[PDB]
């Protein structure tokens, strides 16, 4: 007898990683009569949340919709973790978004070599903001330390809304946050993006350049929102959802919104998804371990 689709986000609401599957869900109602339910669960920079689904019956009527921490990253970081990313059902990709640097406006940079210059000024001081170890703030913030031989200080919340709460505030300097959420503030005037970390421009800020044209050609961090199930899912039940977000990411209201923030829906299928996140594995453990990231156990709020 029907029973309503969960959908575990494990990030505070607000952020893309909310937003996202949301503005799905209002489509999906269609062929899920009982309801299809976002249950948002913080904490451990998405791994409460995960953790939730992957012990979740495999009957495909529970499921994670998350960014890439506990899907593709957080194994590299943790030795030990409560579930085991690996083992995930693939269903789809959402949508692929680029992250970007986004600043405080009081602090004095118009673009990125300005900071970077102000980095080195004021070394082991600037504060980043991150969604949480091992999210793709986290790492895209290693990244660029890396490849600009700055010193800056993680402050880890636990998704971005929090983390935009501080950096508006002024209590955080830098967050290398995706385009989607930060967007609406740059376009007012209460945060400023100094670079897309893409291949090309994005046509939801095409005023704003590429890392690659500000020299950091090797700024590439496309952040993404995937969706998967428990492990033993069967796979013509990974199929049919697949087809069911596939059809909603479709409906032009549903495009539109993704394509007014930035977003790209992808809606690929399962085992295209599956490979594209052990690519994206394998792309992200190279950054680990050339930029030495590491975790920070220690918590912050807003
Ligand atoms: O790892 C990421 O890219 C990511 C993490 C958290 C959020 C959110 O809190 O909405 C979005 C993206």
New binding site residues.
């Given amino acids: 007898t029907p029973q309503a689709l969960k959908i575990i986000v494990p990030?505070?609401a607000?952020?893309?990683?909310?937003?996202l599957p949301r503005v799905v869900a209002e489509k999906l109602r269609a062929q899920f009569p009982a309801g299809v339910l976002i249950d948002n669960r913080t904490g451990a920079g998405?791994n409460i949340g995960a953790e939730a689904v992957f012990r979740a019956e495999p009957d495909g009527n529970t499921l994670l919709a998350?960014?890439?921490?506990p899907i593709a990253?957080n194994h590299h970081l943790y030795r030990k973790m409560a579930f085991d990313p690996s083992k995930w059902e693939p269903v789809t990709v959402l949508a692929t978004?680029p992250?970007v640097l986004v600043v405080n406006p009081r602090l004095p940079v118009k673009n990125v070599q300005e900071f970077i210059a102000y980095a080195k000024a004021n070394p082991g001081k600037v504060t980043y903001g991150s969604?949480?170890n091992?999210?793709?703030?986290?790492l895209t913030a290693s990244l660029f330390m890396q490849l600009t031989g700055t010193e800056m200080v993680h402050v880890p919340y636990?998704?971005?809304?929090p983390?935009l709460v501080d950096l508006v505030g002024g209590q955080i300097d830098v967050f290398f946050?995706?385009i989607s959420?930060s967007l609406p503030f740059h376009q007012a005037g209460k945060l400023r993006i100094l670079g897309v970390a893409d291949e090309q421009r994005s046509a939801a800020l095409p005023e704003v350049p590429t890392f690659a044209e500000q020299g950091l050609p090797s700024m590439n961090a496309v952040?993404?929102?995937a969706v998967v199930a428990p492990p033993g899912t069967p796979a013509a039940k990974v199929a049919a959802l697949q087809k069911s977000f596939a059809g909603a990411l479709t409906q032009p209201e549903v495009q539109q919104k993704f394509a007014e923030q930035g977003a790209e829906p992808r809606g690929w299928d399962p085992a295209r998804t599956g490979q594209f996140i052990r690519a994206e594995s394998a792309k992200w453990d190279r950054v680990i371990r050339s930029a030495n990231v590491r975790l920070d156990l220690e918590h912050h709020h807003h």
């Fill in positions: 990030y505070p607000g952020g893309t990683a909310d937003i998405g998350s960014p890439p921490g990253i978004v992250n969604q949480g091992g999210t793709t703030s986290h636990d998704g971005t809304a983390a946050d995706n959420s952040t993404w929102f």
